[PDB]
Amino acid sequence: AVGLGAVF
């Protein structure tokens, strides 16, 4: 939930 996932 901290939302650190990479987006492209």
Partner: antibody
């Protein structure tokens, strides 16, 4: 292959300063969030700092125990992550790992870990 | 801060046995709970993310479950190469925190 290679560890006196580096390869560096996590002599894992990736907002995050003492930064052109540590404490003694996070909504986990560099802080 | 309590702290099992490792959170953390194995002289390695999601390259004998506060890592037919320290870790809120680890040792 995802490669994360830390350097800079050493013996420092308390109150001193030291900068760690982590050189990365094998992935598109700037998109990813990166962290430092340390492992204490008691084998506890403790998160130290995070810097968000380019589509994540780029901000930095720290636990209270290092706020005002440590600074995480990145040089995307060099594929390098840094940890500038100041006002070091004996409790900072640990193996420091660089870690890369995952992708998308289910991607805040640590996905890859480095090999570690050792910091010993002692008078 | 979220406290993760791992049980048992240490467990000895014979290769081929199956185990269930427990991780209990002090407050609800949805499914934001990940598992790592650290073998001796090595860095941690992701086994399972977001309670139950599988990781390419990790054997099918590792399985995770749980949501809210109570999480389980199953290892079904533990192999010699699986012994080591198992940590859980949450990403529901800052600071990011880890459990203290379960040490899985080989019974002979």
């Amino acid at each position: 292959e995802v490669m994360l290679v830390e350097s800079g560890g050493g013996l420092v006196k308390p109150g001193g300063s030291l900068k760690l580096s982590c050189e990365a390869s094998g992935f598109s560096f700037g998109f990813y969030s990166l962290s430092w996590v340390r492992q204490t002599p008691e084998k506890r894992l403790e998160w130290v700092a995070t810097i968000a990736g380019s589509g994540v907002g780029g901000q930095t995050y720290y636990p209270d125990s290092v706020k005002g003492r440590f600074t995480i930064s990145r040089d995307n052109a060099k594929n390098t992550l840094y940890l500038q540590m100041s006002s070091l404490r004996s409790e900072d003694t640990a193996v420091f790992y660089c870690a890369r996070h995952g992708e998308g909504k289910y991607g805040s986990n640590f996905a890859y870990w480095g090999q570690g560099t050792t910091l010993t802080v002692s008078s | 801060d979220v406290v993760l309590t791992q049980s048992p702290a240490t467990l000895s099992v014979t290769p081929g046995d199956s185990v269930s490792l427990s991780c209990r959170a002090s407050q609800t953390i949805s499914d934001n709970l990940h598992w790592y194995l650290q073998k001796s002289h090595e860095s941690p390695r992701l086994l399972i993310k977001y309670s139950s999601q599988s990781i390419s390259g990790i054997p099918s004998r590792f399985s995770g479950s749980g949501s809210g506060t109570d999480f389980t890592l199953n290892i079904n037919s533990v192999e010699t190469e699986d012994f080591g320290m198992y940590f859980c870790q949450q990403t529901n809120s800052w600071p990011l925190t880890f459990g203290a680890g379960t040490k899985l040792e080989l019974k002979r």
